[PDB]
Amino acid sequence: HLSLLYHLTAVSSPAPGTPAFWVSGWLGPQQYLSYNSLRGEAEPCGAWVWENQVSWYWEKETTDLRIKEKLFLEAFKALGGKGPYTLQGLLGCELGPDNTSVPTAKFALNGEEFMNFDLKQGTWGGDWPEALAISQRWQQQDKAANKELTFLLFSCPHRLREHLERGRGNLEWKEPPSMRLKARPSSPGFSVLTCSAFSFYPPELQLRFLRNGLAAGTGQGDFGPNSDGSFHASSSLTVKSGDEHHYCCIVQHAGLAQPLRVELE
Amino acid sequence: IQRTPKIQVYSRHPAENGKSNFLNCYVSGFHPSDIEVDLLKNGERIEKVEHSDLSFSKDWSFYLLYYTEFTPTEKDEYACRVNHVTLSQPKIVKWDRDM
């Protein structure tokens, strides 16, 4: 089952015109929310702009993230010194079976995981000296822990609940990859075969290579997103000078009923 | 810590000369988040270029997608030029149409 995760980032010295603080919100691999401190307002992204939604939804995303914003800038003061620093937080809930909500709150500083907010003991904590610095600075603030507890135990899974009921089509969206298999001589004696998958959702996809029907390995593979929320995948393999054409490509994806064979034709 | 960007160039839909399309630069796996990226058409900047939010992965490194609407053509090469703390000079990755 799905997740709702907020990606939070703040920086001690943004470029001019850059925000100090910005959040991307994600339902599964699909981004539904944008917020940055410059604009100071939460926005839907993609189809989610057109979701049939309770009228106060984006007011309440905005109010919560402004609180998160103040705390993140506050971390920097409390954090002794001149950095520059980058504070990242991964805050979200996962919905398993039984309608039961598991929570997550991990934090990273200058690209390193160093802190977390424990929900059982309502607490920020970590081993790093700077974990203690921010930790007590957040603890010593009125209401912080309570708002955090609220956001992840109630707000979060509620929001996930609402999107699963109001954005069913959006989450259940399936679009098969357009496929190509091509060849280019790599070196003397050799060719490079590249199997390529265009415009697919969901992101989960596997590609294999076959010689005459029997496995030849996966290529060397790469994934990436498109701008419309769809995805791209590609894989490449080295093969002999002129055989070469006793080869096909095998793609597996949820948007198909059965695996699809891609011939070099 | 510091992490150097991975760069991937490809088009939304399979490339066909004369047919309209989108071109993507996907820059990922990098830290810190400061980054500069241009798409190039035969050596020089594409003007109107959009990008997604600067977001990040389970491993905490950042990722970004740049894109622009375009019409491929027999006469045209494209690339992505990226600048970042971890590089001494801009890395340029040529768009392989098949990729």
């Epitope: 996962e94 598991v102 929570p103 997550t104 709150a105 991990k106 500083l109 200058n110 390193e112 995981e113 160093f114 802190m115 977390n116 907010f117 424990d118 929900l119 059982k120 003991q121 904590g125 970590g126 081993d127 790093w128 000296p129 974990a131 | 810590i1 389970k58």
Partner: antibody
Framework: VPLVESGGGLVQPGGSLRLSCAVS????????MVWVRQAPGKGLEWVAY????????YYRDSVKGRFTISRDNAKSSLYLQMNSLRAEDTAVYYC??????????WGQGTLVTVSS | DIQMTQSPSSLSASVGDRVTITCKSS???????????LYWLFQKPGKAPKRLIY???TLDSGIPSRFSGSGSGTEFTLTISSLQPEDFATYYC?????????FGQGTKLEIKR
């Protein structure tokens, strides 16, 4: 009182066992998790580690092909599937945290004894 | 494969005494934002381990303030300023910087009466 490990017991060489670690002390989803073991009346020994997500794992290489750490954040608990067991695997097995508070939370252990 | 080796393996000392335990790693342990992932654990017989000091010298909550650690590179020490009789246990040092992830053989600490 933060954890409880379970499912130890007596088994033959070759046999298999599944250790469970029920975390209720802290928010399990935040923590890399670790298995550590102690052969009866001897020093502590590191065994395995897992990502909080669940998609990165490490093992001592006297165990690589044979054991398998895993987690179900859903039931905030952690597992060790041990197969192809032999004599030296006899130990009390202890469940702890990895990043970001490595080795801070502990339980009573569970005894796994391997003999014919 | 990065060995931890403690000195001594065994020790009986008198209440009031100042105790010194050393931990020698075969390879340096700094390697982050100047964070050293060395740890001290202790274990009483029939009991589970507990964490004493984390990073190099940070006492865990409720660890009696007479316990302390220091060192930096490859040379580490646990120090009990004034021994008391509950201090009996086995102590271990633990490197947590590169897998594995290894313990010292332990120092068994008994109390002399």
């Amino acid at each position: 009182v933060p954890l409880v490990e379970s499912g130890g017991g007596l088994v033959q060489p070759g046999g298999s066992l599944r250790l469970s670690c029920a975390v209720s002390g802290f928010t399990f989803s935040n923590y890399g998790m670790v298995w550590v073991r102690q052969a009866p009346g001897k020093g502590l020994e590191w065994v395995a580690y897992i990502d909080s997500d669940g998609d990165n794992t490490y093992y001592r290489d006297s165990v690589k092909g044979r054991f398998t750490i895993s987690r179900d954040n859903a039931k905030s608990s952690l597992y060790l599937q041990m197969n192809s067991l032999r004599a030296e695997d006899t130990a009390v097995y202890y469940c702890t945290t990895g990043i970001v508070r490595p080795f801070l939370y502990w339980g009573q252990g569970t005894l796994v004894t391997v003999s014919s | 494969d990065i060995q931890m080796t403690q000195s001594p393996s065994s020790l009986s000392a008198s209440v009031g005494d100042r105790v010194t335990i050393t931990c020698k790693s075969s390879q340096s342990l700094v390697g982050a934002s100047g964070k050293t992932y060395l740890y001290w654990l202790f274990q009483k017989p029939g009991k589970a381990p507990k964490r004493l000091i984390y990073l190099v010298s940070t006492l865990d909550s409720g660890i009696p303030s007479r316990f302390s650690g220091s060192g930096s590179g490859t040379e580490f020490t646990l120090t009990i300023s004034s021994l008391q009789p509950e201090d009996f246990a086995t102590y271990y040092c633990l490197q947590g910087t590169h897998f594995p992830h290894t313990f010292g053989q332990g120092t068994k600490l008994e109390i002399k009466r």
